[PDB]
Ligand binder design. Structure first.
Ligand SMILES: N[C@@H](CCC(=O)N[C@@H](CS)C(=O)NCC(=O)O)C(=O)O
Ligand SMILES: N[C@@H](CCC(=O)N[C@@H](CS)C(=O)NCC(=O)O)C(=O)O
Lengths: 223, 223
């Protein structure tokens, strides 16, 4: 039984889980809980961080004793699963578009993370006003790149379609208004939400839209 | 004639340039300068940013009219060049270790960037203290992973060796002391610095260890 380990957060792990659900691959979900308020300690992880044989101990991690796989980097994990299930590029031309979108998606995660995890309230407002300036342009870039395609690379679904759903959804829940004039991307999310196994996943009583981030974060973090 | 476009900083562009020098590929370096103090305007870039036909306009970017390549994501760019010059994995097993190291290297960049660019003074101090706490453990992980290997993956150099060089060097310049319990990595930097074409590149009258970061940054922004 392959094992995916992560916090009880959508976070970075959700794209991987969406891919797994889509591809029908069975896995055990190993979840870690933070400690109580007001410090939300990571003892649950830190007591085991070095006992799993991981080279670069981190969450998330992916372990498959049967295939001798033991990894710990989100993008490395998802690319590995994508390669296995044929959800990668088939030309160098496709691979370029895909890896750009991958990296554009990760860029959105870093700009969102640097704000949502900000401790100072005054700095949070500066970071947010600043984000509200930056994000429309990124979403328009994505809409343009997508055009009238069903998925980001065409009518074939790729691993970055799952990486883009999660981050776009998180942003959506942060501020609907950012999508007020982006029906193209809202239509795209709805297309993904209607893939059978995704519908199944989002319907599960395990699934909840929040928490997205850790309990120490200003946005998300709170069921 | 391929064009690589970046600021006149080492930042995310340097790994790509180290690879290009190593592989003997000819390129034009298109550099952008910041404005005068104390605003350091980005006009040189922003005047032109959306007029280059890039899908996700950003620095760095890579353009090759001849092969119809036009990209804007550092990891995507370097992987593209790696694929073309055979500096990628030769099994899925190698590719896993490579992409882990890639992502571990990018993790180091995001930790150091979130600190060196910190707009607040109190948070900068906390982030620097947090960094000093986090980093020894990461470097030790890298030293262990490397062991008695000449390069990070083994005896064949890959693109993630150039990624790892740059970020380890930047960290070295930030605080030597961080390498006290992981001295294996200083030998590794020396091995990289002695590859013929790298030696050539680092010996150039155009090469300087600083500036690493932009001039608005709290560390690394001064030649
Ligand atoms: N909630 C964040 C991600 C949180 C997360 O996964 N953090 C990781 C670091 S990449 C972690 O806690 N690692 C465990 C450790 O500290 O060793 C998001 O939505 O992007
Ligand atoms: N010097 C920083 C990176 C600085 C950098 O390259 N910034 C990029 C962000 S990807 C930039 O200026 N891009 C913004 C743009 O092109 O508009 C480092 O240590 O890596």
């Amino acid at each position: 039984a392959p094992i995916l380990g992560y916090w009880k957060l959508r976070g970075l792990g959700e794209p991987i889980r969406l891919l797994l659900a889509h591809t029908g691959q069975e896995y055990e979900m190993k979840e870690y809980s933070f400690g109580p308020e007001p410090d939300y300690d990571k003892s649950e992880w830190l007591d085991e961080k070095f006992n799993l044989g991981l080279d670069f101990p981190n969450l998330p991690y992916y372990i498959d004793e049967e295939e001798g796989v033991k990894m710990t980097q989100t993008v490395a994990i998802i690319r590995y699963l994508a390669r296995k299930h044929g959800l990668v590029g088939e030309s160098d031309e496709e691979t370029i578009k895909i890896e750009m979108v991958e990296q554009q998606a990760i860029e959105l995660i870093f700009t969102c993370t640097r704000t949502w995890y900000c401790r100072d309230d005054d700095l949070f407002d500066k970071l947010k006003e600043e984000m509200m300036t930056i994000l429309p342009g990124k979403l328009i870039g994505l809409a343009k790149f997508l055009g009238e395609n069903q998925y980001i690379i065409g009518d074939r679904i790729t691993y970055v379609d799952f990486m883009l759903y999660s981050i776009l959804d998180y942003i959506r829940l942060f501020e609907e208004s950012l999508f007020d004039e982006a029906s193209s991307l809202k239509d795209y999310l709805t297309r993904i939400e209607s893939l059978p196994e995704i519908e199944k996943y989002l319907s599960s009583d395990d699934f909840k839209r929040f928490p997205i981030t850790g309990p120490m974060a200003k946005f998300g973090g709170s069921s």
